[PDB]
Design an enzyme around this catalytic site. Structure first.
Site, PDB file in Angstrom:
ATOM      1  N   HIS A  40       0.745  -3.744  -2.204  1.00  0.00           N
ATOM      2  CA  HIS A  40      -0.169  -3.012  -2.737  1.00  0.00           C
ATOM      3  C   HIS A  40      -0.591  -1.952  -1.970  1.00  0.00           C
ATOM      4  O   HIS A  40      -1.547  -0.332  -2.363  1.00  0.00           O
ATOM      5  CB  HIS A  40      -1.471  -3.915  -2.611  1.00  0.00           C
ATOM      6  CG  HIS A  40      -1.732  -3.692  -1.201  1.00  0.00           C
ATOM      7  ND1 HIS A  40      -2.071  -4.937  -0.220  1.00  0.00           N
ATOM      8  CD2 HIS A  40      -2.374  -2.888  -0.039  1.00  0.00           C
ATOM      9  CE1 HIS A  40      -2.302  -4.565   1.238  1.00  0.00           C
ATOM     10  NE2 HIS A  40      -2.907  -3.489   1.257  1.00  0.00           N
ATOM     11  N   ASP A  84       2.912 -10.134  -2.752  1.00  0.00           N
ATOM     12  CA  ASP A  84       2.702  -8.493  -2.204  1.00  0.00           C
ATOM     13  C   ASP A  84       3.473  -8.088  -1.301  1.00  0.00           C
ATOM     14  O   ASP A  84       3.548  -8.283   0.185  1.00  0.00           O
ATOM     15  CB  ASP A  84       1.302  -9.148  -1.351  1.00  0.00           C
ATOM     16  CG  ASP A  84       0.620  -7.245  -1.139  1.00  0.00           C
ATOM     17  OD1 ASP A  84       0.959  -6.336  -1.610  1.00  0.00           O
ATOM     18  OD2 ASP A  84      -0.780  -7.128  -0.157  1.00  0.00           O
ATOM     19  N   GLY A 175      -5.994   0.043   6.723  1.00  0.00           N
ATOM     20  CA  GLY A 175      -4.940   0.380   7.418  1.00  0.00           C
ATOM     21  C   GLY A 175      -4.215   0.055   7.514  1.00  0.00           C
ATOM     22  O   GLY A 175      -2.641   0.685   7.769  1.00  0.00           O
ATOM     23  N   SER A 177      -2.513  -2.417   6.161  1.00  0.00           N
ATOM     24  CA  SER A 177      -1.619  -3.147   4.890  1.00  0.00           C
ATOM     25  C   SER A 177      -0.366  -2.399   5.712  1.00  0.00           C
ATOM     26  O   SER A 177       0.167  -1.850   5.473  1.00  0.00           O
ATOM     27  CB  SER A 177      -2.509  -1.915   3.791  1.00  0.00           C
ATOM     28  OG  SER A 177      -3.707  -2.521   3.709  1.00  0.00           O
ATOM     29  N   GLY A 178      -0.054  -3.340   5.036  1.00  0.00           N
ATOM     30  CA  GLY A 178       1.513  -3.464   4.906  1.00  0.00           C
ATOM     31  C   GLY A 178       2.790  -3.084   6.187  1.00  0.00           C
ATOM     32  O   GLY A 178       3.338  -3.920   6.095  1.00  0.00           O
TER      33      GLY A 178
HETATM   34  O1  JKZ Z   1     -10.777  -5.194   3.989  1.00  0.00           O
HETATM   35  C1  JKZ Z   1      -9.769  -5.523   4.759  1.00  0.00           C
HETATM   36  C2  JKZ Z   1      -8.772  -4.696   3.925  1.00  0.00           C
HETATM   37  C3  JKZ Z   1      -6.843  -5.458   4.415  1.00  0.00           C
HETATM   38  C4  JKZ Z   1      -5.634  -4.616   4.841  1.00  0.00           C
HETATM   39  F1  JKZ Z   1      -6.367  -3.792   3.798  1.00  0.00           F
HETATM   40  F2  JKZ Z   1      -5.136  -5.793   4.410  1.00  0.00           F
HETATM   41  F3  JKZ Z   1      -5.205  -4.404   5.206  1.00  0.00           F
HETATM   42  C5  JKZ Z   1      -7.386  -6.434   5.645  1.00  0.00           C
HETATM   43  C6  JKZ Z   1      -8.522  -7.115   5.914  1.00  0.00           C
HETATM   44  N1  JKZ Z   1      -9.843  -6.568   5.412  1.00  0.00           N
HETATM   45  C7  JKZ Z   1      -8.043  -8.142   7.345  1.00  0.00           C
HETATM   46  C8  JKZ Z   1      -6.909  -8.697   7.176  1.00  0.00           C
HETATM   47  C9  JKZ Z   1      -6.323  -6.986   6.716  1.00  0.00           C
END
Ligand code: JKZ
Ligand code: CA
Length: 223
Positions: A40, A84, A175, A177-178
């Site tokens: 993503h 993912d 933020g 993410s990844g």
């Molecule tokens: O809206 C979000 C977006 C993420 C993301 F984008 F995967 F980091 C996460 C949470 N909530 C909690 C775990 C990581």
């Protein structure tokens, strides 16, 4: 990262920032040429930033290297976030040192109860928004499959695990993410999704890296 701690500069030497004019995702350096991140996080025009602590200041240990190729998992589904995971090849090899280092792939999957380290430059607030400059860290256990499925009815596949705290207060967030989930010196997870951040009974959900080791190795071997 909500409810975490300041890691310390270059204490997480496999942590990368993906930059397209600004930080937008984390990733993990897995050899001198390749980074693992979330599917993503895919976009064009990625610069990989290694050796980062403060992402807004050039502190002297950074390496900035453009991506030459990204490879999203063939079975990634952006609606369900199943599979993912993405690989990013660097245009040139990173110089490896104490502060810029690859993280080992797992040879075996990790069990519920295993303690891990989750890191990133994501939002530090569960209500409202504040983005840190320096890398944040969170120690968190892997949660049982049953408790993960209970938390997210109908959404947890065999390629996902939950980690964190059912009481809330401590989680990854937007933020992050990844970025990496490292347990006993192995990359076991990738920050994938959640519902809000740090909410009760809504722990973070992570891509189960051990399921992808064969794909990662054979992709690297031919690209
Ligand atoms: O809206 C979000 C977006 C993420 C993301 F984008 F995967 F980091 C996460 C949470 N909530 C909690 C775990 C990581
Ligand atoms: Ca910096």
């Amino acid at each position: 990262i909500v409810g975490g701690y300041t890691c310390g500069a270059n204490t997480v030497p496999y942590q990368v920032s993906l930059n397209s004019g600004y930080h937008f995702c984390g990733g993990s350096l897995i050899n001198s040429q390749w980074v693992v991140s979330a599917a993503h996080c895919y976009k064009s025009g990625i610069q990989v930033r290694l050796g980062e602590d403060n992402i807004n200041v050039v502190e002297g240990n950074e390496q900035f290297i453009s991506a030459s190729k990204s490879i999203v998992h063939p079975s990634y589904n952006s609606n369900t976030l199943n599979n993912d995971i993405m690989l990013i090849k660097l245009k040139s090899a990173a110089s490896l040192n104490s502060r810029v280092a690859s993280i080992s792939l797992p040879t075996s999957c990790a069990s519920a109860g295993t303690q891990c380290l989750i890191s990133g430059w994501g939002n530090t607030k569960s209500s409202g928004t504040s983005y840190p400059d320096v890398l944040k860290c969170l120690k968190a256990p892997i949660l049982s499959d049953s408790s993960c499925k209970s938390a997210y009815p109908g959404q947890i596949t065999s390629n996902m695990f939950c980690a964190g705290y059912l009481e809330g207060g401590k989680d990854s967030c937007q933020g992050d993410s990844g970025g990496p989930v490292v347990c006993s010196g192995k990359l076991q997870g990738i920050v994938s999704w959640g519902s809000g951040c740090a909410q009760k009974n809504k722990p973070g959900v992570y891509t189960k890296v051990c399921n992808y080791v064969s794909w990662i190795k054979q992709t690297i071997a031919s690209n």
